[PDB]
Amino acid sequence: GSHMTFVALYDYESRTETDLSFKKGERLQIVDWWLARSLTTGETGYIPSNYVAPS
Ligand SMILES: COC[C@H]1O[C@@H]2O[C@H]3[C@H](O)[C@@H](OC)[C@@H](O[C@H]4[C@H](O)[C@@H](O)[C@@H](O[C@H]5[C@H](O)[C@@H](O)[C@@H](O[C@H]6[C@H](OC)[C@@H](O)[C@@H](O[C@H]7[C@H](OC)[C@@H](OC)[C@@H](O[C@H]8[C@H](O)[C@@H](OC)[C@@H](O[C@H]1[C@H](O)[C@H]2OC)O[C@@H]8CO)O[C@@H]7CO)O[C@@H]6CO)O[C@@H]5CO)O[C@@H]4CO)O[C@@H]3CO
Ligand code: NI
């Protein structure tokens, strides 16, 4: 109901073709690794869920 929007707690650099880089403070909408869309870049890929918190 609002539990699909998150904010990055830490920077993260992509390792693979399927993960998504992000910066601390970047917000992510969810579509241990979650499929997300960056609300900064619109790119969609997997993120480590422990790197983000509810926003
Ligand atoms: C450009 O100005 C016209 C535009 O102005 C208003 O849009 C605002 C928007 O409201 C505002 O949002 C709050 C912000 O937008 C930001 C996004 O919200 C944010 O997610 C991110 O956006 C990302 C996208 O998510 C990514 O997908 C990607 O987009 C690039 C596309 O990749 C898929 C790429 O194809 C290319 O887009 C083309 C587009 O191709 C699909 C093409 O469509 C025909 C054309 O878009 C038209 C559009 O159809 C038309 O709609 C009426 C209008 O759009 C206006 C909005 O209506 C208005 O909303 C209030 O004009 C567009 C331009 O003519 O052209 C596109 C551009 O080439 O390129 C995409 C950009 O790289 O990447 C982006 C960026 O990371 O960031 C957005 C801000 O950058 O700002 C908007 C204006 O900038
Ligand atoms: Ni929710």
From Swiss-Prot:
**What post-translational events are described?**
The phosphorylated form is termed pp60c-src. S-nitrosylation is important for activation of its kinase activity.
Q: Where is the SH3 domain?
A: 5-55
Localization, per the record, is:
Cell membrane; Mitochondrion inner membrane; Endosome membrane; Nucleus
Q: In which tissues is it expressed?
A: Expressed to high levels, and with a high degree of kinase activity, in certain fully differentiated cells such as neurons, platelets and macrophages. Isoform 1 is widely expressed. Isoform 2 is expressed only in the muscle.
How does this protein assemble? Answer: Forms a complex with polyoma virus middle T antigen. Interacts with AFAP-110. Interacts with GJA1 and PXN.
Q: Which family does it belong to?
A: Belongs to the protein kinase superfamily. Tyr protein kinase family. SRC subfamily.
What role does it play? Non-receptor protein tyrosine kinase which is activated following engagement of many different classes of cellular receptors including immune response receptors, integrins and other adhesion receptors, receptor protein tyrosine kinases, G protein-coupled receptors as well as cytokine receptors. Participates in signaling pathways that control a diverse spectrum of biological activities including gene transcription, immune response, cell adhesion, cell cycle progression, apoptosis, migration, and transformation.
Question: What is the protein name for this chain?
Answer: Proto-oncogene tyrosine-protein kinase Src
Its gene name is SRC
The portion of the full protein included here is: 85 to 140 of 533
